[PDB]
């Protein structure tokens, strides 16, 4: 039903810093979730993010101390600010919304890619 659409990918360099956005194009509860998931070349994808009520966050063990997810509840739109990004960090990332009545239905975006570089 509901689009999700990120925007902000690209390219950026190791230690850099990068901010993801996604927008719904309807009406998102503020106590579902809206969350990042992410999926790197020859791994399976993986949880990143997620809030809900506004400022109730959830990281993976691998970002927590550098990422930091933000959600706009009036806009529908949720944010993934990146900083002290590491080479292990390049995937595409996909915003994801969990909703709360059962927890049994998961909404996808179409993905945006991120690339670290190490090269300087
Ligand atoms: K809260
Ligand atoms: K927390
Ligand atoms: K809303
Ligand atoms: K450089």
């Known amino acids: 039903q509901v689009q999700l659409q990120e925007s902000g990918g690209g390219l950026v360099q190791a230690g850099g810093s990068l901010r993801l956005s996604c927008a719904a194009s309807?009406?998102?509860?503020?106590?579902?979730?809206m969350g990042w998931y992410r999926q790197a070349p020859g791994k399976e994808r993986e949880f990143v993010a997620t809030?809900?009520?506004?400022?109730?966050?959830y990281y993976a063990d691998s970002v927590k101390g550098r990422f930091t997810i933000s959600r706009d509840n009036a806009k529908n739109t949720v944010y993934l600010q990146m900083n002290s990004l590491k080479p292990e960090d390049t995937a595409v990332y996909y915003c994801?919304?969990?909703?709360?009545?059962?927890?049994?239905?998961?909404?996808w975006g179409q993905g945006t890619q991120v690339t670290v570089s190490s090269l300087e």
């Open positions: 309807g009406y998102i509860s503020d106590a579902y979730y």
């Open positions: 994801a919304v969990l909703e709360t009545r059962s927890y049994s239905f998961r909404y």
């Open positions: 809030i809900t009520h506004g400022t109730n966050t």
